[PDB]
Amino acid sequence: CSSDSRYKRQVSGDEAYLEAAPLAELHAPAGMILPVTSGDYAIPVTNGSGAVGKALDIRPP
Amino acid sequence: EVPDNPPNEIYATAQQKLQDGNWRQAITQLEALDNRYPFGPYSQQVQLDLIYAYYKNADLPLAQAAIDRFIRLNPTHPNIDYVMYMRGLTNMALDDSALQGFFGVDRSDRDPQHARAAFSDFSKLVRGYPNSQYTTDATKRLVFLKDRLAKYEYSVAEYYTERGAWVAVVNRVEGMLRDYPDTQATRDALPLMENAYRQMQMNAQAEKVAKIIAANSS
Amino acid sequence: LFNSEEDVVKMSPLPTVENQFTPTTAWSTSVGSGIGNFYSNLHPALADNVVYAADRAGLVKALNADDGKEIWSVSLAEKDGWFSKEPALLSGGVTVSGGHVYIGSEKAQVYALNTSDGTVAWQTKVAGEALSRPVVSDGLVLIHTSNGQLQALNEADGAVKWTVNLDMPSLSLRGESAPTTAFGAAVVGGDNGRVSAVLMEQGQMIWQQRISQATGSTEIDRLSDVDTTPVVVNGVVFALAYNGNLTALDLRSGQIMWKRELGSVNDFIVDGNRIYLVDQNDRVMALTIDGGVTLWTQSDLLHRLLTSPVLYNGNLVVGDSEGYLHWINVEDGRFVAQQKVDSSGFQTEPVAADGKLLIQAKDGTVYSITR
Amino acid sequence: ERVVYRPDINQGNYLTANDVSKIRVGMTQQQVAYALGTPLMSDPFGTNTWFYVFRQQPGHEGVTQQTLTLTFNSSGVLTNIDNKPALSGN
Amino acid sequence: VDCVAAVVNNGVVLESDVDGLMQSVKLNAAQARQQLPDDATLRHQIMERLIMDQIILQMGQKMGVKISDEQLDQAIANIAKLNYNTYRNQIRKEMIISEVRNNEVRRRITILPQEVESLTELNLSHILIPLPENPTSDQVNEAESQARAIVDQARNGADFGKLAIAHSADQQALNGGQMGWGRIQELPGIFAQALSTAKKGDIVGPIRSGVGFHILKVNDLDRAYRMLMNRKFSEEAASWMQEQRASAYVKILS
Amino acid sequence: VKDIHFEGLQRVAVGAALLSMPVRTGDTVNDEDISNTIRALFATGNFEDVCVLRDGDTLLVQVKERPTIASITFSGNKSVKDDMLKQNLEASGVRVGESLDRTTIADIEKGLEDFYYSVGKYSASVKAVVTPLPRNRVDLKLVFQEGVSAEIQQINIVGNHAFTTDELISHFQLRDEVPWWNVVGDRKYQKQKLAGDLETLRSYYLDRGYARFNIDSTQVSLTPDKKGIYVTVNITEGDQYKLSGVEVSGNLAGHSAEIEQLTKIEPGELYNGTKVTKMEDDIKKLLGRYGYAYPRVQSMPEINDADKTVKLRVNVDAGNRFYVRKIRFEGNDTSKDAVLRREMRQMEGAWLGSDLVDQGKERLNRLGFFETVDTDTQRVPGSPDQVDVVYKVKERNTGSFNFGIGYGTESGVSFQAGVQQDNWLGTGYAVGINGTKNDYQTYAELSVTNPYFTVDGVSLGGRLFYNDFQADDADLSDYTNKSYGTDVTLGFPINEYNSLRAGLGYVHNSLSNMQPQVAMWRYLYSMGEHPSTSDQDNSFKTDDFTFNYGWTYNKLDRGYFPTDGSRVNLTGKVTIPGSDNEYYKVTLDTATYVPIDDDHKWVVLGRTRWGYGDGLGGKEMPFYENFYAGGSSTVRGFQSNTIGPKAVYFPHQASNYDPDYDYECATQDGAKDLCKSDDAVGGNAMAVASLEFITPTPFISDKYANSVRTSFFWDMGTVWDTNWDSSQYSGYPDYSDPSNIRMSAGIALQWMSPLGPLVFSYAQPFKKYDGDKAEQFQFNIG
């Protein structure tokens, strides 16, 4: 029973993904530049205020 | 099994069964309703509820096909963001075994074929619908998947460094630096590139990596 | 053992007997072994008060008429091959003319033998396997091998005179087409669906006309071959197809006068001003030669695996794969008599050259029929 | 403690004397790539430099490395060539 | 109350046209000095005629084309010597159905020039007993008994129109089966031998045929091309009517 | 028109229905109008029996709707799957959820029959059943009756004077006659097999020096009964030609010598067809071994009829050397990347070796916990030199659970249990823990092994086992044997396929209250503690400080369920000074596999086991480390621990108290003389052998051919003692004769259940001797 009386409206129990080290760039030193990126694994900056974790509900609207 | 009833009461009792929490009865009723009247008003609702029932019941192989069919047949549905989020969530949940995590072993250097698909789907959702109610969770999962892929590549580079294949580790770390130049994995993997450049006596090239790690030592 | 792995098919039961007459067997003698479940044209022949017959193995019997007396018997098994005891696999129709008998086999070998002694007059290898009854005419023996290669053996000694390359489709029906000779020109239907007339004494095509139908419903199956023997009368050639166009056409390179949507693989006969035939699904029809207007259609028999109908005393005798013999009146299509002559089953055409009637069972013996 | 087995490790670009002698100063990227082949490694930090490593160690009997460094300009001209047959740092 | 009488393929035969045709044929017979048998038989014959008309109209209305109404008006004005729109409609239907039937029959017959074939009048009634494509179930049998009964009752002296409307299948059953003026060289080949022995005022017995057992009764005693084309057209049209009726779906509502 | 009343609108919207009629509300109506409206309702193809009714109050229409297809049933489809049938019905539009058309059903039926033309069924009959259901619905049944499949009557080959027809037919696949004794197929004709069979015929004539031979044409005739099929093939075998010389040329890339050696053929031997393609493939493999992965090799023969000779010209073109950019594995959801990548002979950033990648794939197969391992070399899109290597692997259920207790003939409970993994969460370790806790014994064995302690592959393993075989509840007379041992082994590979192992071990053993047995007293007198033969009160202690060695050769295609190769495993332990015992023991296991078909299905298995142990000097090998045979793993057909000698019971007062007519082994009031018993004491020499014929399963299709194995086995075994004395017994049997070769034969089935490999075996002994207990049915987990 996946519902289990409190698991009826949220994602699977594991939530290790909430705690992740924030991504920080590498400073370019003098006399050289870091290699140009590829633009295939990047995340844009977007407004927050969206419920995450078990707060967000997953059931058809 | 199921009776030959009009969609009203069968749909109502399927909803009641799902609200109770018994997934098997709900999935059987929804399958019967979809196979009975695959033209009626409830078809979209039937599919959107079948996806949820598949995901909760741990039937991801069928869920992926159902999501693909729904997104293909309705490329302009008002709630495509929900189905995209469900696809990106089931692809990521397929990457966990629920038994390895009991002992705490890191599921990072395993086969990253589902993590890449989940990252692609989450990126597609974020690009397509910036103003939805799933964007923050999608971005958090994107960051987690990026870190996981970086750690996998770092593990492969570490194995090549241990064996003594310096060209291979140089190429792997260069790929990490070109693709993932912000994750902690690259920051911890730069010394491997330093050592690999050191082994081939190419000190002139090694000084550049030394400067890279010195400028970011803080 | 595959009989237990196949579902039972539906076949129309035999009708009421109403035996007005009960023919009997004049002599129920036997010839060789049986050809078995091998579709071939190996009917016996009758001439000069004797009858010639052969089996699948290669044995040839000449038998006396008016009784079951066995005149002589020879063996045509290959005594000169790799094993020197191989079966010849005789399949060409046993034809007789003068003092000669012509037989064909599915080994590209056509044999001609002298009568009253059974000695091999000669043999000849032809292009492809012989599968049609040789036709003797104008000092030549026309054969229609199952490759589209119509051939003409020299009667005197046996040699290739010329060849004609008829078309051949990919999944053709059986090609047992016997050419017929009129006014020094041969007419023959290939497996493509085109009836062609060829100048015999020079080896040049005179004309070719397509007698077939459209692609129909499905391309798979739905064959369009013409393996029945064209019949020439009054300068008119009659031919039949598988899907069907009962075509009557002018002999002097003329076009067609009419056609019908009727398709047969067995032989059809022309008597007086009427055409009698049996087609696929085993229906016996009598039609008018003037415009192909159907006179009557007896169809109570259905999928009985009939044979070529024959004339006898003004009525139609029809064989059956169940060993029965059915008798049909010339008009009104009403049944007249039934005869359970044998249980082996019939597959070849009856012969009615004289007042006698002969039928050869596929797995058994020959049979003579009285009134 | 040196009796265990070890597969021979190949890491280089497999340079040969004829191929390196074929190259002369003043060529372009396309024809040098056609002559030698794509480099398996090149610096991603500062400029356009091509490294041709030939590293080969059989079992335990030493290590043999031949190094080639090609320095190019902005317009893809072979500005400088340098070769090193063995490990200078002995 | 236009309840659909029968269903054929897609279209249907209603009840309005049935009554209309009954009234038209009754009035025309009255002005042509004719009488009528039991009304149930007339109604059934009219219903069968409309079923045939609809099934032949389906193959030629969904395809082919229509007829220009100006030539239709000229033709009706010329042939002249109730509701105007209705009668115009039935005349248009008759013209289009005649055109499509003529086209379909002309497709099925080829005529070589009469030179290779080289080279009196009768007014007669044609009674036909319809037969199925495979009368294996002994249809021809009862059918034969009915044919002999019809011949007997014609000998007894009953009205020819009655026996014609009784169990005919030709399109002239509503007019006694008349075929107009026909020459001995303008008749089917199954009829020439009968005509040779035929005589005015007598009856010719049934002739076996694929279409059915024909009954021929004699009432009154570049040319070769049309002479042979007429008989070929008649025979092949009868056969094609039989084929089309056999190869269709018909549902009867009662 | 004031209103319109509808009687019979259930599945049709009233608005669209009203739109259907040309007339609507507030319109003048007459006969022509209503007639045209009825015709218009039937123009849309939605109704079946509509009719207007005489109603003074405005309009009244009764409408009958075409029923909706509720479900479709396909009863009778013996040889056709239902999903394809449903797709075919969809193709004509008869899918569930649409109105049923009575007009279309016949066509529907026809369509189904046409589909059967594909399979080979021609006289098929399909019947449509329309079962009414309330709410205006129908249930559709398609009753099938497939008549017969096409049957080949005879394949004929016309024109030849060198070979017979039967010889050529015997190598085809469309057998025209199946023997009445063997039935491994039917005479079913498929268009796809014709090309393959014709290619077989062409190769058969080509390889025997027929260069000018070609296929004229072929005909596939159908009899006019839609049941029989004839096949005719025309040929022109030509003449016998001989090969003369080879003139290979092209861009050899400096490899002319060994290539010429590869193509070197002596003149005078006839032309061949398989030789040319074998030589081309060998040249391609040799070129690929040095780096040239994508060459172009063409063979062209020039034939001269003056001497009927043929000269073969081979044009070879070696392309650019291919390097490897990255090798990545897919499908390893459990096993980590390091486990797969640590066994590879081709490495990133190196010139490609077509043999190194194959060695890597074979090593992955030999590892033992991968079901299928497929290699794939994909060209890099934007590069002409670089290539990628991908290993597609599918995981398998490694590990095993061993359970069961054993309560036969009211025996004591033994809750034994064991877990084997061979892979711990994919980490590559080998962890195994087993044993039982009991009121009369205790067993606990734990084994850990890391096979890659270093990079090269040294394996470090340890094993700790504590076993108290007490057999004791309350009485002291039981043979109490308490022993704890710890073993540590280190192994390393030398050359290839060969591993050596050396290790240390400590075993502390103690025996008390031992039953009188002659071998026991012989061992004790070898140590010469001089025990008495009239009392059961004995104490024995020993501390073995041993030294273990071993050698392993393993070259076989698959780690589990092998089909080719050989394995040899030698293990031997020797004592060193400082222990109470002095002995040496060696054991040797061998398993050889030989395939028969090129497809590797029928297998010949040859298994042997040998064992010899003897004291170093003065001392003799202890009885508690003896050898044993029989059981479900060594000689199938006998109970475990049965082969070999039998114990002799010294009778005396303290041997058995004889309480309540129990303990009747050698008690003084139940026996007086030395007796030969049925208890099996192990011998110090063992030799067993076994021959297995492994055949494909006759019960399961090919989708699970590598899940269960069936084998007919014949086993031989013997065990004997060396330090035996013959004349010391006047008439007791001599257990030192290595001649009583116990034999057995039977059948065996192996299946990997999700608890381990379960083995069933039925064996019937063919040779039996005194004291040899035989069991026919055996079952184990292993």
Numbering used by the authors:
A (entry chain C): 25 to 85
B (entry chain D): 26 to 243
C (entry chain B): 22 to 392
D (entry chain E): 24 to 113
E (entry chain F): 25 to 105, 123 to 160, 172 to 273, 395 to 427
F (entry chain A): 26 to 807
What does the paper say about this structure?
The outer membrane is a formidable barrier that protects Gram-negative bacteria against environmental threats. Its integrity requires the correct folding and insertion of outer membrane proteins (OMPs) by the membrane-embedded β-barrel assembly machinery (BAM). BamA is composed of a 16-stranded β-barrel, which, in E. coli, is preceded N-terminally by five polypeptide transport associated (POTRA) domains that extend into the periplasm. Unfolded OMPs are delivered to BAM by the periplasmic chaperone SurA, but how SurA and BAM work together to ensure successful OMP delivery and folding remains unclear. The results suggest that SurA binds BAM at its soluble POTRA-1 domain, which may trigger conformational changes in both BAM and SurA that enable transfer of the unfolded OMP to the BAM lateral gate for insertion into the outer membrane.
Given the importance of the BAM-SurA interface for OM biogenesis and the fact that BAM and SurA do not form a sufficiently stable complex to allow its co-purification from cells, the BAM-SurA complex with an in vivo formed disulphide cross-linked at residues K27C (SurA) and R76C (BamA), was purified directly from the E. coli OM. The structure of the complex (shown schematically in Fig. 3a) was then determined by cryoEM, revealing the structure of the BAM complex with additional density corresponding to SurA at the expected location adjacent to POTRA-1 of BamA. Interestingly, two distinct conformations of BAM-bound SurA were observed. Both conformations showed the expected BamA-SurA β-augmentation interface, but they differ in the conformation of the bound SurA molecule. One structure has SurA in a ‘Compact’ conformation (PPIase-1 bound to Core), while in the other SurA is in an ‘Extended’ (PPIase-1 released from Core) state. BAM is in a Lateral Open conformation in each structure, as judged by the position of POTRA-5 and the conformation at the lateral gate, and indeed in the Compact structure, a salt bridge appears to be formed between BamD and POTRA-2 (BamD-D28 and BamA-R162) which is observed in all BAM Lateral Open structures solved to date. The Core domain interacts similarly with both POTRA-1 and POTRA-2 of BamA in the two structures, forming a discrete structural unit. However, the position of this unit relative to BamB, and the resulting interactions made between the SurA Core domain and BamB, is different, with SurA bound at blades 7 and 8 of the β-propellor of BamB in the Compact state,, but moving to blades 6 and 7 in the Extended state. This shifting around BamB results in an ~ 18 Å movement of POTRA-1 between the two structures.
